[PDB]
């Protein structure tokens, strides 16, 4: 029922190899729908989802200029950040940015986001009130002071509470056949002996959307969290996702183990056993 829109900015400096590269990707939930790359032959916002292609040329032209302007701003930020941390001009650095809004089933704003990271570490983030900032270090305190003086947060809030939610609701409507459809996981359990006294039970979950899912193994009704090998949820390449959990069991005790699957597409949690 809940939905989200996210934009992910990535700027990477490359001393001796040109000016910093700027790339942006836009997501509705777990579905990417737009992209932009400053290293492309002709930098422009490009559609990555069928339901966004219906937007006119004025849509793509306007956003392209926004990305180009943001790219230039990021380069200014990167230069400032080096000075904040007393870094030389020889090292490469990364500025990441992610912002967006979360809405409920009625389309009302639940939560807004606007945060930054420098070289993989959190730098500054707009608080949940969308009025104040949280700085990670004394360098980010400089940014905080500058943005507090310019009342930067007010502009962020106006977008997150207005433009962000309104366009998200529009996107959800235009692609409701996909964005508002939850695909349940296709599940099965495999069995492979590693010896004559032990065997591996692997519980599979395939072809599900969205990516959010819970896979657990239980022995005699007790969670086997520590003894469960759980791989990261992975994309299949067809919008859907994959995941599995495995447990090493003594030979002959396979029926004492049960796999539990929870997903939005499932009305009730599933319980699986081997064969």
């Amino acid at each position: 029922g809940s939905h989200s829109m996210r934009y992910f900015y990535t700027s990477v400096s490359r001393p001796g190899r040109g000016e910093p590269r700027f790339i942006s990707v836009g997501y509705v939930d777990d579905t990417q729908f737009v992209r932009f790359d400053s290293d492309a032959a002709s930098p422009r916002e490009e559609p990555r989802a069928p339901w966004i292609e219906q937007e006119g040329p004025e849509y793509w032209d306007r956003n392209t200029q926004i990305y180009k302007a943001q790219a230039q701003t990021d380069r200014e930020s990167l230069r400032n950040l080096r000075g904040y941390y007393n870094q030389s001009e020889a090292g490469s650095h990364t500025l990441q940015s992610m912002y967006g809004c979360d809405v409920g089933p009625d389309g009302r704003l639940l939560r807004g986001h606007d945060q930054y990271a420098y070289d993989g570490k959190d730098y500054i983030a707009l608080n949940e009130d969308l009025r104040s900032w949280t700085a990670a270090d004394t360098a980010a305190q400089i940014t905080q002071r500058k943005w507090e003086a310019a009342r930067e947060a007010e502009q962020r809030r106006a977008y997150l509470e207005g433009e962000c939610v309104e366009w998200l609701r529009r996107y959800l409507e235009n692609g409701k056949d996909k964005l508002e459809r939850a695909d349940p996981p296709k599940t099965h359990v495999t069995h492979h002996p590693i010896s004559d006294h032990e065997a591996t039970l692997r519980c599979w979950a395939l072809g599900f959307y969205p990516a959010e899912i819970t896979l657990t193994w239980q022995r005699d009704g007790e969670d086997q969290t520590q003894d469960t090998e759980l791989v990261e949820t992975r994309p299949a390449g067809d919008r859907t996702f994959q995941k599995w959990a495995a447990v090493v069991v003594p030979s002959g005790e396979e029926q004492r183990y049960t796999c539990h699957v929870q997903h939005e597409g499932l009305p009730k949690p599933l319980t699986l056993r081997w064969e």
Binding site: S24, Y59, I66, L95, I124
Partner: peptide
């Protein structure tokens, strides 16, 4: 659509 006029860090 993305937000514009975002200030530099």
């Amino acid at each position: 659509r993305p937000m514009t006029y975002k200030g530099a860090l």
